[PDB]
Design a binder for this molecule. Structure first.
Ligand SMILES: [Mg+2]
Ligand SMILES: [Mg+2]
Ligand SMILES: [Mg+2]
Ligand SMILES: [Mg+2]
Ligand SMILES: [Mg+2]
Ligand SMILES: [Mg+2]
Ligand SMILES: [Mg+2]
Ligand SMILES: [Mg+2]
Ligand SMILES: [Mg+2]
Ligand SMILES: [Mg+2]
Ligand SMILES: [Mg+2]
Ligand SMILES: [Mg+2]
Ligand SMILES: [Mg+2]
Ligand SMILES: [Mg+2]
Ligand SMILES: [Mg+2]
Ligand SMILES: [Mg+2]
Ligand SMILES: [Mg+2]
Ligand SMILES: [Mg+2]
Ligand SMILES: [Mg+2]
Ligand SMILES: [Mg+2]
Ligand SMILES: [Mg+2]
Ligand SMILES: [Mg+2]
Ligand SMILES: [Mg+2]
Ligand SMILES: [Mg+2]
Ligand SMILES: [Mg+2]
Ligand SMILES: [Mg+2]
Ligand SMILES: [Mg+2]
Ligand SMILES: [Mg+2]
Ligand SMILES: [Mg+2]
Ligand SMILES: [Mg+2]
Ligand SMILES: [Mg+2]
Ligand SMILES: [Mg+2]
Ligand SMILES: [Mg+2]
Ligand SMILES: [Mg+2]
Ligand SMILES: [Mg+2]
Ligand SMILES: [Mg+2]
Ligand SMILES: [Mg+2]
Ligand SMILES: [Mg+2]
Ligand SMILES: [Mg+2]
Ligand SMILES: [Mg+2]
Ligand SMILES: [Mg+2]
Ligand SMILES: [Mg+2]
Ligand SMILES: [Mg+2]
Ligand SMILES: [Zn+2]
Lengths: 61, 213, 105, 159
RNA sequence: GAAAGACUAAUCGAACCAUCUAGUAGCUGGUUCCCUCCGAAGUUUCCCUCAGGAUAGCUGGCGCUCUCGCAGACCCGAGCCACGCAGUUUUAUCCGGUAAAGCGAAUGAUUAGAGGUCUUGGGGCCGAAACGAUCUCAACCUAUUCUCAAACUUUAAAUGGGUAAGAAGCCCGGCUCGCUGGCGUGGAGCCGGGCGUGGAAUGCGAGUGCCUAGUGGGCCACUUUUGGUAAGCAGAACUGGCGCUGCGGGAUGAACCGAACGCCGGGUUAAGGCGCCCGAUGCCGACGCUCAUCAGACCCCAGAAAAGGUGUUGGUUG
RNA sequence: AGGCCCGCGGCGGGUGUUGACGCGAUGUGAUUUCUGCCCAGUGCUCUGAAUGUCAAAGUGAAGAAAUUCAAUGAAGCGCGGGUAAACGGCGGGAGUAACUAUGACUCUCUUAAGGUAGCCAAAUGCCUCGUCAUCUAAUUAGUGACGCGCAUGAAGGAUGAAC
RNA sequence: GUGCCAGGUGGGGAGUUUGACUGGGGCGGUACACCUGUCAAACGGUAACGCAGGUGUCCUAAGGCGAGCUCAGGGAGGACAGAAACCUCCCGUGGAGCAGAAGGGCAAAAGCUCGCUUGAUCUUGAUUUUCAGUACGAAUACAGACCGUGAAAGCGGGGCCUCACGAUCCUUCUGACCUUUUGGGUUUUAAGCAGGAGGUGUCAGAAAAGUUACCACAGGGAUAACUGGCUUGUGGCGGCCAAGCGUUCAUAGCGACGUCGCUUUUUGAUCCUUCGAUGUCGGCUCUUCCUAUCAUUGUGAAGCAGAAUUCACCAAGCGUUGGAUU
RNA sequence: GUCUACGGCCAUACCACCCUGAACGCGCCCGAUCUCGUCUGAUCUCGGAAGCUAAGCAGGGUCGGGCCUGGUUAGUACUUGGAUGGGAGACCGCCUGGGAAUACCGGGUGCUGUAGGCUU
RNA sequence: GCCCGGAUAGCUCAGCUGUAGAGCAUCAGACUUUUAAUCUGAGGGUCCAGGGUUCAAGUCCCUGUUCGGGCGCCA
C-alpha cells in the first residue's frame, strides 16, 4: 500500500561519482542577451573598423 | 482521566505554548504562584531557600499544584501563616497533547489508528532545566531547617531529582546577603514591597537629591 | 467588472492610437460546412453510436470576457479582440462609481 | 508538500535590517557597473521590481550586460550534481561590488609596482604570499617577576 | 422448470466439440559453459501513475583530442621546471537568522508586591450638608519583579553557502562606432607594443563525443528532527553501511567494533582477549571496593525506577 | 383487421379442433372476520380543447446556385382528469384534572395523507437478560400480560379445527 | 398492408465503464493544480491523512501619471451634544491603510483626496521561477512603434511583491486589396497563415452507474481478519510522600493531591512472519506449569478478651465442587 | 570660527528642557495690484523691507533618555569532529577546534564633498 | 445554444396608444344586547429594467433579470 515519499539519501554520492564540474569558463563569451541597441552599434563599429586601416598602420609604423 | 506523568516526563517536542494557533487549551491546575505573607518587606525575610532541578524534564501543572500545597501546609504548621513567603518559579506554558483512542472492543468503529494522529490539547506542563529553580521560600533566618524540611517534603511530588539550596542572596532579591546591608545603608538599594530597587549612580541629579533628603 | 463603451487605443491598420467602440464578443453560429463538422457528420452517420467524446465534466464557472474593439475611423473599420481576466459579472458602460456619497440606507 | 512560490521562505531574507527601513540611499544608484566586474547579489525587499530569486541571494557573479536600471549577471547555480552558469537580470538596488575582486586588483597593481621597482634596484623580493609560518625562536623575559601560580577553584553551586 | 439459478449425458449464474488461437497479461514460475576486467539503483519530473512506464541521475563499452617526456649502446641532470583539475585547507571578501540569548526592547503570553493621582469602580464605618472629611478596594499611570514562544525578536554563534587568489593578466599608445554626448565625453569593439618573480598550501594527467544495460519496493546506525504514551511504529536531514561483502572480535546475529578479499611462506598488529572449554598472564602484577538465603561480570545488547538501610567505605558542613 | 407470444423471411406460426362461464398477464394464498387514510412522487391509463415544443418530406421567399430563411405542424413530451387487491407512503413540539402521577382537553408548526381495526420484546424491540405474574431450589429459556412499537400493521392484518 | 426514410419509445436485448491517494479496503477527507507562515537543523532543497490558514475571485479603477496632504490612537477644549454627531489645538515610527490568507514592503510613501487619462494597447527575441533546465502559468530586463501623464527629470506596457489558472483535435471571431481551391478564367464556398476566445478542477488535459453470499482468474504476506513479535495508551497488580478517614490517633486497617513502576490473563497501536492455506468461537477430555495464596501446614500484626474477621511472611505439596438459564 | 545652496554616509546626527548668538546669511515679519490657490493671502503663489532674534536655525549644558563604541557577563551559553567515556534513563563529563547575548560598569554625542559669503 | 410564454395594490385577476380597474389585505366610521355581515368611506400599486416607435406607452419592436415548458449537445 503505502511507500516512501521522498529522499535525497545517496544522491550526493551519485553526484560526486563523476564529479560536480563547474561550467567551462572559456574566452569570448557569447553575446546572447546583450542589449540589442548596444549590439547593433557594436556591429556597426566592427563593420567600419576597415576604414582607418591606413592611419592605424601608419601609427603602428 | 489523566495519563501517568511518565508519558510526558521528557522534553521531546518543541515548545507548544497556548497561542492563537493552539486553541482550546484547558486551564492549568496551578493558578496561584505566591503564598504566605507576600506583602512582607525585604528586610523581614532575609533567608532564601530554593529547590533546584537536576534534570531536564517536564513538570506538570498538577504536580506543581501538589508541591505548592504540601509546602504551604508544612510552612503554615511550622512557621505560622505569616512567617514565610513562597514563590513558584515555574509556569506551565507548554501544552501536551493526546491522540485519544476509543477504549472499547472495536477497531472498526472509525478508530483509524495512526491516521490524522495529531492530538488535542491534554494539559499544560512546565519545562525545567538543570540548575533551574522550581520553588523559593523566604523567611526569618531561624526557620532554615523548616524551609529545608518543607522543600524536602515538596520534592516527593515531582518525578526527577531535586536539590535544596540555601541561597546567598537576601530574600528574593538578586543581591548578596553580606553586601545587602551596606548597600541599603549607602542607598544603592531602596526597598519597595517585597523587592529592592537598584539606584545606579547615573541619571538626573534631581533623583539623587530627592534621596539624601 | 465595468468597462466604458469607448476607449482610445492602438489601431493596427491606422498604425496609431484611435478611438474604438467596445462591444462584447459572442461566439458565432456553427457553419455546418466547416471541415471538422463535415468529418464529424460523416463519422456519426451509420451505426456505431457516439464516435467522439462528450465533455460533461464542467469545472469553470466563468469565461474570459472578450472585447470587440472597432476603430471609429470611417475609412478604417478594423476590428480587434482583447481578452480580459475571468469575471462573474460584466457590464459595458455602466454607471461610474463616486467616492464621497451616501450608501442607501 | 512545499509550495513552489517565488518568495516562499524569504520572510527574513528579504526583510530590511532593524531601523534601516524607508528611502533607499542614493549612492547605491550612483554606483557604476561595467561589463566583466564582480558583484554580490543581495536582494533588498524595499524594491520589488527586478528582484533576484532566493537562490541567488548571497551569491556572486560577473556582469555581462548593463541596461538603464539593471544588470545582467552570470552566476553559478548548483542543480543536483551539476553547476550551470545562469544569466539573471537584477536591478542595481540588489547588487553591490565585490571587495574580494577590488583587493585582488589592488594586489596585482602593487605587485607590478614592486616588480618594476625591484628590477630597477636589483635586489629580488618576494611576491607570492605565504601561509602563516611556524613561530620562530624567541626569548621571554621574566623581568624579575615570578609567574603567577594558577590553581583550579573549588566547586560551589551558584544559582 | 409446482421456481432450488434447479436440470439440460458424473459438466450449468449459460452444455459439449472444433476453429479464430501460440488470444492478452503492467502478474507468478523458469531461463542451460568457463575465466578476466569494470560495476549500480531503489532518487528528480511527467503519466487514470501508486506491483508499471517515459525522463534525468547512477553503469558499461567504443573511442577521439591533448599534456610530461620517451634520452644517453653500460654509465652519466647538465629565478626556471606541463595543458588543466580538486567532496581539502589558507588568505581576502560577501551571504544567513538556527543553537544560544532577550522580554526593567517591539509583538503575543504571564506572577507578585510598591508609589501616585482623575473617574458612572465598589464605596465609607460619625462623611447627604461643599464624600464638612479621608479610610479601604478597583480601574489607570509610573518604576520595579517571577516565568515563556515552531508559526516573536534588538543582539547573535559553531558548522555552512558563493566569489577571488593573473598571461583570457597588467601597462602604454592608435583606430572604428549609426550607441552616448557641453567636451578631444562615456562605453564597447578592434589594431600594434612592452612586461614571466607563472603572483597561496597540498595533491592529481586532463578535455571531449557516441551508444547504452540494470534500477526507479529499500533498509539500518551516530547525530539533528516531525507525528505518536510508545513501538523491532510512521516520516524527513547528514554521513557511513547492509542490500552487492567475505574475514578477526561481539558465544549466537544482514547493519555493531576492527578491517574490506588473487594463491601462498615468514614477521607484526587492529578490535577483542589471555582459569578450562579455547590460542594467549603457569606475572611471586600494583592499589583499593564488595558477601548477596534472586551477588557481579564489558558498545549496540538483550531487563528495571522512585524510595529506603545503625551493611561497609570515603567525603562535606556543623 | 383482436389480446398475449414465436419468427431471419412469407398476411408465416402458437393459444386456436379456441370466442369473454374463453384465452392471455399479474398479485395474494383454505375457511372465518376484516382489508382503514393518501393520486403529492414514480408508473399506468382517458381526452384533445384554443393548445407550447416537435424530424423527414412537402410549401413559399431571397440568391447565379450550392445554400439560407420563413410559414405550416405526426407521435411523443408538456397542459388537464382517473387509478393504491399499481409501485409505494401513512408527523412533531408545548401546556393542562382539588396529593402526586398520567393527560380526556387546549394551543400552534407541518404533510399527499399523518399508521385506522387489530397484533406484539412476536421468526419483526436496539436499549434488553424490558417490567409484572406463572413454571423451578435456582430459568439470558417457555407461557400469560403490558406497550411512545430503534424499525408492527392490514391482498395482506388478526384468528381457527385438521395435518 | 408491404418496401424505403424520418421522429418517439425501447435494460426485452447488446457492448462497455463504474478515478486515484489512503498507517488494509470501505465511509470520511483531498494532503490530486496552486499560495503564505512553520516544520527546515542561520545558502538553496527537504517528507507524513505534520501544524495555522488561504485560492477557482475582485477592480474604468482598486490600472497609469502628477500634485497636495497624513494615518491608528490619545490628551485638552467648544450651544443643544450625552460614551460615540461636528469644529480646534497638541502628541503621535506608523501601533492605520494598501480588495482578500499570511508574510515581506511602504510616510511631503506604495496610504488619503483631487486633476488628466487608458502602458490592462501593437510587436520580435532574451531571461528567471517549476525544471528534465520540457511545456503552461507567472515574472524580470531590454529593444522597436503608438500613446498617457508631469514644468521636467522621468514613470507607465495592469493591480507594491509572493497565488488567482489550461495542450493536441474541433469550433468561433479578428487581420493581410495574403496563399490554395487540382485543365484555364470570374464569383460564391471551403482550406490555410497569425492572434484572441469556447476546457479539460483527476487542473501535462479518457467520454463513464451499481450489485454479486451464485461468483471467476492472475497475483499479493507490497495488504486486513486468527497466533506469535515490539509497545503498554487502556486494563490489571504494586510502590514512594502523607492532607485526611479511622469515637482520640497520618501509617491496626485505609490513602486525597501528586509521583515511580511491574505484567502481558483486557482492549488498543503497528503490519515483521504466514494468502502454490498454520483449520477460525465455545464446551468436553487430559497433562503440565505460574503465583499476584481462596483453603490447608508453620508464623508475625490488629481498633487480636473468646468466637469470627482483617493485614502480612515462608509457601504452589494438596485441593478448589454439583446444578437452573444462555 | 561659522553660515548659505546642493548633497554623501543616515541618531556620535534623535528626543526633552535650559543658556548664548558678533557680521553676513537663513528666517520670523509687512502687504494682496499683478501670477496663482484657498471656507479663510493660515498654507501655496506673488510684491516687498518697518521691526525682531521671541521662534526656527547654530553652538553649548543636563551625575538626562536614546543611539554609538568598549569592559564585564565569560572562555560561560552554544557548537565542528572523537571514544567499546559515565549513567537504567534524563542527560552529563573529557579530548579536538570555534565561541555568543542581557543585566551591571565606563567613554563618546556627527564626520565630510562641491560652490559661494561673513568673521582686522 | 434554439423556440415559446409569465412578471401588474400584501395576494389573485383583468386590462387603451386618447381614464391602471375588480375581488380579497389593512384601517377609520355607520349599525347589533353582544355578535354578526352589510355598507359609508380612507390605503396600496416600480402596471419586472433600458433603449427606440412615439402629439399619445404597462400596452408597439428590440436589447437586459428571474420564473416555467419543450428541443438540441464532437473542444
Ligand atoms: Mg519509491
Ligand atoms: Mg515530537
Ligand atoms: Mg439465490
Ligand atoms: Mg494461452
Ligand atoms: Mg513481485
Ligand atoms: Mg527560518
Ligand atoms: Mg531558543
Ligand atoms: Mg515582550
Ligand atoms: Mg523508519
Ligand atoms: Mg513500513
Ligand atoms: Mg535486491
Ligand atoms: Mg558498493
Ligand atoms: Mg563487509
Ligand atoms: Mg565474526
Ligand atoms: Mg552477546
Ligand atoms: Mg600470515
Ligand atoms: Mg573468549
Ligand atoms: Mg590455553
Ligand atoms: Mg391463484
Ligand atoms: Mg390497503
Ligand atoms: Mg403534438
Ligand atoms: Mg382513491
Ligand atoms: Mg397502533
Ligand atoms: Mg413491540
Ligand atoms: Mg425473539
Ligand atoms: Mg430447560
Ligand atoms: Mg410473550
Ligand atoms: Mg390492553
Ligand atoms: Mg446490460
Ligand atoms: Mg541547513
Ligand atoms: Mg534553508
Ligand atoms: Mg505623491
Ligand atoms: Mg517602449
Ligand atoms: Mg508590478
Ligand atoms: Mg496531472
Ligand atoms: Mg508484511
Ligand atoms: Mg495504568
Ligand atoms: Mg484524625
Ligand atoms: Mg495443512
Ligand atoms: Mg497443523
Ligand atoms: Mg509469594
Ligand atoms: Mg545618557
Ligand atoms: Mg568543546
Ligand atoms: Zn483604424
Amino acid at each position: 500500500a503505502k511507500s516512501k515519499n521522498h529522499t535525497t539519501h545517496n544522491q550526493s554520492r551519485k553526484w560526486h561519482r563523476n564529479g560536480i564540474k563547474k561550467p567551462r569558463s572559456q574566452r569570448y563569451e557569447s553575446l546572447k542577451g546583450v542589449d540589442p541597441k548596444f549590439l547593433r552599434n557594436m556591429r556597426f563599429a566592427k563593420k567600419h573598423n576597415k576604414k582607418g586601416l591606413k592611419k592605424m598602420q601608419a601609427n603602428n609604423a | 482521566g489523566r495519563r501517568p506523568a511518565r508519558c510526558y516526563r521528557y522534553c521531546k517536542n518543541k515548545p507548544y505554548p497556548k497561542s492563537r494557533f493552539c486553541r482550546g487549551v484547558p486551564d492549568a491546575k496551578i493558578r496561584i504562584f505566591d503564598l504566605g505573607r507576600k506583602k512582607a518587606k525585604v528586610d523581614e525575610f532575609p533567608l532564601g531557600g530554593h529547590m533546584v532541578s537536576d534534570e531536564y524534564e517536564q513538570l506538570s501543572s498538577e504536580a506543581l499544584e501538589a508541591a505548592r500545597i504540601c509546602a504551604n501546609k508544612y510552612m503554615v504548621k511550622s512557621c505560622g501563616r505569616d512567617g514565610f513567603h513562597m514563590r513558584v518559579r515555574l509556569h506551565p506554558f507548554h501544552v501536551i497533547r493526546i491522540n485519544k483512542m476509543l477504549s472499547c472492543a472495536g477497531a472498526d468503529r472509525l478508530q483509524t489508528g495512526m491516521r490524522g494522529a495529531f492530538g488535542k490539547p491534554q494539559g499544560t506542563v512546565a519545562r525545567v532545566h538543570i540548575g533551574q529553580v522550581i520553588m523559593s521560600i523566604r523567611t526569618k533566618l531561624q526557620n532554615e531547617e523548616h524551609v529545608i524540611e518543607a522543600l524536602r517534603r515538596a520534592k516527593f511530588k515531582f518525578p526527577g531529582r531535586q536539590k535544596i539550596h540555601i541561597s546567598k542572596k537576601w530574600g528574593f532579591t538578586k543581591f548578596n546577603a553580606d553586601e545587602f546591608e551596606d548597600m541599603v545603608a549607602k542607598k544603592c538599594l531602596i526597598p519597595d514591597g517585597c523587592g529592592v530597587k537598584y539606584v545606579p549612580s547615573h541619571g538626573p541629579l534631581d533623583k539623587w537629591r530627592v534621596l539624601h533628603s | 467588472v465595468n468597462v466604458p463603451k469607448t476607449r482610445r487605443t492602438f489601431c493596427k491598420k491606422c498604425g496609431k492610437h484611435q478611438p474604438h467602440k467596445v462591444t462584447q464578443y459572442k461566439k458565432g453560429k456553427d457553419s455546418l460546412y466547416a471541415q471538422g463538422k463535415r468529418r464529424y457528420d460523416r463519422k456519426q452517420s451509420g451505426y456505431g453510436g457516439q464516435t467522439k467524446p462528450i465533455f460533461r465534466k464542467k469545472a469553470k464557472t466563468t469565461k474570459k470576457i472578450v472585447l470587440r474593439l472597432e476603430c471609429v475611423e470611417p475609412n478604417c473599420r478594423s476590428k480587434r479582440m482583447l481578452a480580459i481576466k475571468r469575471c462573474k459579472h460584466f457590464e459595458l458602460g455602466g454607471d461610474k462609481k463616486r467616492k464621497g456619497q451616501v450608501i442607501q440606507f | 508538500t512545499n509550495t513552489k512560490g517565488k518568495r516562499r521562505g524569504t520572510r527574513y531574507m528579504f526583510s530590511r535590517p532593524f531601523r534601516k527601513h524607508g528611502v533607499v540611499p542614493l549612492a547605491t544608484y550612483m554606483r557604476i557597473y561595467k561589463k566583466g566586474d564582480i558583484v554580490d547579489i543581495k536582494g533588498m525587499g524595499t524594491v520589488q521590481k527586478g528582484m533576484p530569486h532566493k537562490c541567488y541571494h548571497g551569491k556572486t557573479g560577473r556582469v555581462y550586460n548593463v541596461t538603464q536600471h539593471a544588470v545582467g549577471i552570470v552566476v553559478n547555480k548548483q542543480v543536483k550534481g551539476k553547476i550551470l552558469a545562469k544569466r539573471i537580470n537584477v536591478r542595481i538596488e540588489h547588487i553591490k561590488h565585490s571587495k574580494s575582486r577590488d583587493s585582488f586588483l589592488k594586489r596585482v597593481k602593487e605587485n607590478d609596482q614592486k616588480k618594476k621597482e625591484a628590477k630597477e634596484k636589483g635586489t629580488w623580493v618576494q611576491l607570492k604570499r605565504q601561509p602563516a609560518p611556524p613561530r620562530e625562536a624567541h626569548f621571554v623575559r621574566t623581568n624579575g617577576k615570578e609567574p603567577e601560580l594558577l590553581e583550579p577553584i573549588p566547586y560551589e553551586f551558584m544559582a
